[PDB]
Design a protein around this ligand. Structure first.
Ligand SMILES: *CC(=O)N1N=C(c2ccccc2)C[C@@H]1c1cccc2nccnc12
Ligand SMILES: *CC(=O)N1N=C(c2ccccc2)C[C@@H]1c1cccc2nccnc12
Lengths: 305, 305
């Protein structure tokens, strides 16, 4: 049946993308009800980014200094305020295309879809995981600021990420929809450290179950292991330790395939210790950790929205 | 800046997905203007699929035997006809959400986005390439029939694929929007051969340019080669031969990076002959061929729709 990195349909989110301009700077905004959300660094010039004092920079700005455009229509700004690293522009008209929505702060290891935008217009959609070190490995060029990450539950869009910056290492950093950064990052053009990244062990195991469901079974060995013995091998390979919560979450995929979680752990241990020996799993020559146990189940059931 | 497998925004295509039922069989249809397009095997039972005579099976069906539903609204069917392996149901109302559209028959090696649907509702979106052997490696469960593939050019949606079946090998087969299968496949439950698959050489080269644009340069060697010498190595590795048309298409990426196409060919030759030696390129331990030279340029310019 196949297994792919699948993003959510983006239609409900396209209808919310606007263009926000403040002087020389243009970026993307999110229009829900009568409020437009965008990164607060829309108020900065290139020079201001070296060491910005956002409170002082914002005081020089009035409602008329912000131009919001949705399609070829100019929204009128009647209020402005800073909430952490997000700017909230109150507009005179509610978005008629506002979907049912929630703002959520996702956990490291969880996935979401990104609708990459430029000048308020969508260009593409792809799936991402929030790394354990709170960075994402996306595809974002200059102008993509304000692009959002989200998940869908039938009719409800849960927004979880807003793009703010690229670190000098090439990975991406951003905030939740309340303006709080994921990780220790700050909205300033200064060299910042993301820290050691680790592999999402529960996600690699979920992907091994999807491989068995789709006929790939070569990696299955005759060994089993214990949670502590496996974790001795996980720490050496910078893999996050496995806990009984992760084993419980893997329950449905273990019940569907007849393979106990600890037996799948022993196979992962031998893959970590001996490599793939020129072989592939689900069309990949690496161990994949950007698929949660939920993403595996959704793709095998055909859950719709 | 990053490089990802990015699908087109799916909003314009979600508005066209309907559910089509004929007796016991339900699948997805595409509603454009006053016509619904769906696989003709919507008229079959499971037993009929072993050896269907579509002309005889369709004669037993009248307009009232087809139920078309878009959301919770039942469209009235006022005409029906078979065009190759596609059924065309004329309805009494035009889709108010019909985008600007074209039907196109794509070439092997070209890419497109798939909006996987179940019961007329979208579940996800992902990018695919039409393999040189006219199969696709997608993610499709029972009920996904009628799901469509497409590309977007600013405001115009070009539909290129309709999902019809999975081969016993796990790969997927389907038609263009005129009902003509890509490849030698037929809509029957019989064992079918896809034939030897080859690697899209021009796509692997485009991906090597994107790697250099994003800082990955380790694979660049001090060698060059000729078109015929490279093709001697391509034939041995089941890679499609490179021609001056492919070299011309790679022109912009060669001009952007300062690396002649034939020098990138020599690097590909050494990667084919010596492997990756435990290293990765753009987060992959395999040579990627599902990105066209156009997909690389779009992702480095930020082209919007
Ligand atoms: C996310 C994004 O588009 N940008 N982030 C930028 C940044 C610069 C210094 C420190 C942190 C973040 C620059 C770039 C950007 C933002 C807003 C408007 C733009 N217009 C043109 C080009 N780049 C940008
Ligand atoms: C594409 C698709 O969903 N299906 N294709 C099927 C097929 C069977 C035999 C030979 C060729 C193709 C079966 C499956 C399907 C189609 C239509 C309705 C369904 N309802 C439930 C389950 N599967 C299907």
């Amino acid at each position: 049946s196949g297994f792919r990195k699948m993003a959510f349909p983006s239609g409900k989110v396209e209808g919310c993308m606007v263009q926000v301009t403040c002087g020389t700077t243009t970026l993307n905004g999110l229009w829900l009800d009568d409020v437009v959300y965008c990164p607060r660094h829309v108020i900065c010039t290139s020079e201001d980014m070296l060491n910005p004092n956002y409170e002082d920079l914002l005081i020089r700005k009035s409602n008329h200094n912000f131009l919001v455009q949705a399609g070829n229509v100019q929204l009128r700004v009647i209020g402005h305020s800073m909430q952490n690293c997000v700017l909230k522009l109150k507009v005179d008209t509610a978005n008629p295309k506002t979907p049912k929505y929630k703002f959520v702060r996702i956990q490291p290891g969880q996935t979401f879809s990104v609708l990459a935008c430029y000048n308020g217009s969508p260009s593409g959609v792809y799936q991402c995981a929030m790394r354990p070190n709170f960075t994402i490995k996306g595809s974002f060029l200059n102008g993509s600021c304000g692009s959002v990450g989200f998940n869908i539950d039938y009719d409800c869009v849960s927004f979880c990420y807003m793009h703010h910056m690229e670190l000098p290492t090439g990975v991406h950093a951003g905030t939740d929809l309340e303006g709080n950064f994921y990780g220790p990052f700050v909205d300033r053009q200064t060299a910042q450290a993301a820290g050691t990244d680790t592999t999402i062990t529960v996600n690699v195991l979920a992907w091994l179950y999807a491989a068995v469901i789709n006929g790939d079974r070569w990696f299955l060995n005759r060994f089993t292991t214990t949670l502590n013995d496996f974790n001795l091998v996980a720490m050496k390979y910078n893999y996050e330790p496995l806990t009984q919560d992760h084993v419980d979450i893997l329950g449905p995929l273990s019940a569907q395939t007849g393979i106990a979680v600890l037996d799948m752990c022993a196979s992962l241990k031998e893959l970590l210790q001996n490599g793939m020996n020129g072989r592939t799993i689900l069309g990949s020559a690496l161990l994949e950790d950007e698929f949660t146990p939920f993403d595996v189940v959704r793709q095998c059931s055909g859950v719709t929205f």
